Amino acid sequence: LGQEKERFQVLPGRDKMLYVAAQNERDTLWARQVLARGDYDKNARVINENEENKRISIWLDTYYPQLAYYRIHFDEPRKPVFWLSRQRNTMSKKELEVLSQKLRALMPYADSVNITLMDDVTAAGQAEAGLKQQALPYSRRNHKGGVTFVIQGALDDVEILRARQFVDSYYRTWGGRYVQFAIELK
Template identity: 50%
Template sequence: MVAAEDNVSDFQPYVIRILNGPLMGCEYPLQAGKILFIVGKHSAVAEEDFFPVLPGDTIYIPLEQDGVNFEITTDNHDPGDGQIALHELRDSGGHTRYVECNTPVRVGGLGIAVRARDEAWSTAVLSYPETGGGKQGKKRRGYLVPGLCLLALAVAIPGAVRLWNTPQHRTAELNALLGDEQHRFKILPGRNHLYYIFARNEQDRLWARQAAVREGYGDSAQVIDADEENKRITTWFDSHYPTLAYYRLHLDNPETPQLWVSRQRTDLNASLRKHLTESLMALLPYARAVDIVPVSDETALSQAEEGLKHRNIPFYRNSKGDDLTFMISGELNDTEIFRAREFIKQYNQKWGERYIQFGIELKNDRNKDRSFRYGKYMYVKTAPDVWNFINPQ
């Protein structure tokens, strides 16, 4: 006879998010199969004889009132169909309904939402209103959530003990650690038994890293952002693929990163592409797949030119081998310099700095502090005893 847990795949096609109560904001990846959710007061759950023997895939969610146990079944539905089966376990009997993914759903007094793993949360889910408590309740939740996330997975439930060191538990712990700021991050388990917290920028990365170290997760969780990862990848490429003409590794979705390579300057046959993909998968343990995307050098070139022209920034091109530099040159004021630097930053975030580079070459105004105007007349003092009068028409 096959054990019940053998019927459950390690594939985790969905993620559930708790929208209210003590665990508001906690998320759990859902394995394919049937997951049981026990919802109720933690004081009652802690009683030794409260539950019979429960299945292995059981998650406890504390809720002070209107708790309704339920099951979510994910093995018969593809994430792409937009619906999922939810079976409520009430005293009056069971009831099955199909709920829309990425949409807030009420099960008794509990608010939840389920999405496909590759999707981002919808605005309706992220803006789901918190009921009651006010600022004081929100402040108290900041202190209670870490402990309650642990309680949700382990207290007094035999079936939940197996979840203690699973991705569901660790992800919930890290989400609780980030508190009200968790929407700024994405947490992924790595194949190397580490967890990766993706930040949007350096400031967020430093904040999350400090929080992780302070709470004792310095060794088990790594906090990274796209720029830091690209620096690491660049160093690795310089050693292992020094001739590869690539632009940038895009981590908009870190589960499926995209490596942009030059269509004109890169010749990857099937064997080389496979070897490169396998190498990147080993280098990026949080990725489920890596896409190698050929892009046109002409597109990169035209976007640089059009971006500078659109902002009325003077420039000229300087080519040297496979490198191309756009030199921004002229008598620029502070506003124009700021506008140029902002464009360069945006361009490099998309295309990187390996093929097209930018330089700023400022020229001084030779007439600064030498030109004067009175009424409609003006003159330039070119020497101590020389004045050039100009009558602008």
């Protein structure tokens, strides 16, 4: 990979394909272009966290429709970590091993998929803390199966930016399936 060794990871697939793991969309596009140039399109794929999370969510929409979960993390791409709700889980260890097996089959570059339970109260508390940290007025509204944090009042361009970066960061960690943020409209 050369000077690109820090941006990308090449992983072997169970499907005999090669996977290039990228860190963002701009690297993903560029990497796909390089592939589409040397004609490796049929033999290699470029992956990223955001796309893979969307792709697996589609599959879950049809196979595990009532599933209470957060997000998959790929800090170690050969061993992704699937974050599930601790409070809202209904499945036994055996059923969770089945899910993990089916997730592995969907990600040919993954040795295994670890299912890890995450606390809902913690999920919402980390959202609250980040808003308190920036002395942002907000209302926490608890609904059935989620929480909305409504950010209130006017904010300057800097504060609008700093709040958007917090929100973006939160979603990258937790996904947008449980806690959501919104901006007050008056």
